[PDB]
Design a protein around this ligand. Structure first.
Ligand SMILES: Cc1ccc(Cn2cc(C(N)=O)ccc2=O)c(C)c1
Ligand SMILES: Cc1ccc(Cn2cc(C(N)=O)ccc2=O)c(C)c1
Ligand SMILES: O=C(O)c1ccc2cccc(O)c2n1
Ligand SMILES: O=C(O)c1ccc2cccc(O)c2n1
Lengths: 318, 318
């Protein structure tokens, strides 16, 4: 044991907890200045005692050397797309089809509802709580390794906040740029005679394809987690909402507008609520994502492979 | 000009036409014996004058040498899967969803309805009317080259029956084994102390994975064409039924139980009709395939990529 190793451990623990409170809870317990006091105290100590420098320390987000080219990653579990709807009648027809397709339709039929963000789909791997890899969705089967870029995102934890993390946990989410950050960036680009971005989605997409992590770090990107891929060494909750609440309780940023709605008319109320809140969110959204909440019902319903919307095979009963 | 070249041309033309009448029209104009008289007259002449032997002649279906291994083919256009339904209520919900998803719902809403065969999905390429390649569906993106096996199928034309064939035409269909053929095969297998097949689908699947075309030829396989992939140098009809009628008019076998039905209640009548005819078809079917008939409406509706059935993105209108 040494005093300096204990001082580093305590600084890192404290700093990870303040990041959680600021980014995930939106209720920091100390001012920004106090966080910064400790952050550069940790950075200086680590540089004066490099023997105790760790790769997942809060001061190690930015890789000092720009990359040459992104490697390709094949997803262990593929990243699927979502079916879409454009009207209440269409959504009602979607629910009516699930209602008769299910063996036993429960009363109520609960949905986990969230805003649909206008961002870049990513997959982030934590091995025994530590961030080791991150990838773009790409075509859903193969993507680009953007680990160094993802590590610069301030609300992305380099270490899960739990003493017993899963053996492996793959978090899926969307990287986006909030309005305030997007406006700030364009004022900086114009003030420094550089090109501007047409919209927040283009700015986020451009920031994630930078080969220099130092540029990505200056871009105000935010992750919002909406799913889980691989999950080894853990008993995931049996509802989709409980799984998102579990991600949040271990340090992962999740959207705070997520709700549970019983039946189509409540789900339609949420859609109109979110539609009315658009002017006040501070980030771009394209719609709402409505999912069956009960996990056993999702498994029972399953997936639809790449198929035309204009054909259907009405099979005979045995 | 030579007498023997004219005699070969006339024999081939005649034999291709009798094959069309026997296999596609199910109305042969001559007895089986007359067809055979000409078939082995052509075979003998070709062997006595090998200078005039053509690769697409009716006597050239079976490659004399067994293959070593099937090469892999990547489909230019991917082979999609079908969404499925299991009840009238579910089918009605599927139509109601298309009804509101369409910009302009016509009156009537016509469907091209067919039996769903229990067979092996294949893709067959004709280049300037001649059969050059055939492939298994495989995963929908890549399959196995089964050209030599497909060439042995009696109802598959080696040459399209048209003086102006498309530059390239890819026919999509299912290879199956009718009941009478399946029963015959198992009596032969049992009489020759060999293994039997559990059902016609397993027998068809086993026959198409034979590396020896000589074995496939002894297996009574039938093609039924249900679609078109590549179609260059042709103006395909603007309805799905007209496209199937066009395939049939150029020599391609198409199922004769295909009908047009206006609206869901007529489509449901077809399903019950086919369900009642099952006992009398002479081949296995699993259900019915119901497609929007108008091609512009199919294009408007489009496809659904690999997605969960339990989620939907209700997007906001602009
Ligand atoms: C100078 C400075 C320091 C920190 C921050 C924001 N912030 C604050 C905390 C905090 N309050 O616990 C935690 C993490 C974080 O990133 C800004 C914008 C500027
Ligand atoms: C001996 C023999 C010859 C032909 C056939 C069947 N068949 C008949 C014709 C025909 N009638 O024009 C055309 C093609 C064909 O394959 C069988 C089963 C047996
Ligand atoms: O497979 C999924 O659950 C899935 C796939 C794609 C998505 C895109 C946006 C939001 C989601 O919840 C998504 N969820
Ligand atoms: O993409 C298609 O049209 C398609 C795809 C797969 C099929 C399987 C059986 C019958 C069909 O008409 C099929 N059609």
């Amino acid at each position: 044991m040494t005093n300096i190793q204990t001082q580093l451990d305590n600084l890192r623990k404290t700093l990870r907890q303040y990041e959680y409170e600021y980014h995930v809870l939106d209720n920091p317990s100390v001012p920004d200045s106090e966080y910064d006091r400790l952050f550069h105290q940790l950075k200086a100590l680590e540089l004066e005692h490099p023997e105790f420098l760790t790769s997942d320390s809060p001061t190690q987000r930015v890789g000092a050397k720009p990359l040459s080219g992104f490697s390709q990653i094949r997803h262990e579990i593929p990243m699927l797309s979502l079916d879409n709807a454009f009207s209440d009648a269409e959504f009602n027809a979607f629910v009516k089809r699930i209602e008769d397709r299910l063996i036993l339709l429960p009363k109520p039929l609960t949905f986990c509802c969230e805003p649909k963000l206008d961002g870049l789909a990513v997959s982030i791997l934590y091995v025994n709580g530590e961030l080791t890899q991150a990838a773009t969705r790409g075509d859903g089967t193969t993507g680009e390794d953007i680990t160094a870029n993802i590590r610069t995102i301030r609300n992305v934890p380099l270490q899960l906040l739990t003493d017993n993390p899963p053996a492996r946990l793959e978090v899926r989410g969307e990287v986006f740029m909030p309005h305030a950050g997007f406006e700030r960036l364009n004022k900086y680009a114009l003030e420094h005679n550089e090109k501007t971005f047409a919209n927040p989605r283009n700015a986020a997409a451009g920031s994630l394809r930078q080969l220099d992590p130092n540029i990505t770090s200056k871009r105000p990107l935010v992750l919002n987690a909406y799913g889980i891929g691989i999950a080894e060494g853990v008993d995931l909750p049996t509802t989709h909402y409980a799984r998102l609440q579990w991600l949040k309780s271990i340090g992962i940023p999740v959207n705070p507008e997520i709700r549970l709605c019983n039946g189509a008319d409540e789900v339609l109320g949420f859609y109109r609520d979110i539609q009315n809140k658009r002017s006040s969110l501070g980030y771009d959204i394209d719609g709402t994502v409505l999912k069956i909440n009960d996990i056993a019902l999702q498994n029972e319903l399953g997936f639809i492979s790449k198929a035309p919307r204009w054909a259907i095979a009405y099979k005979f009963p045995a």
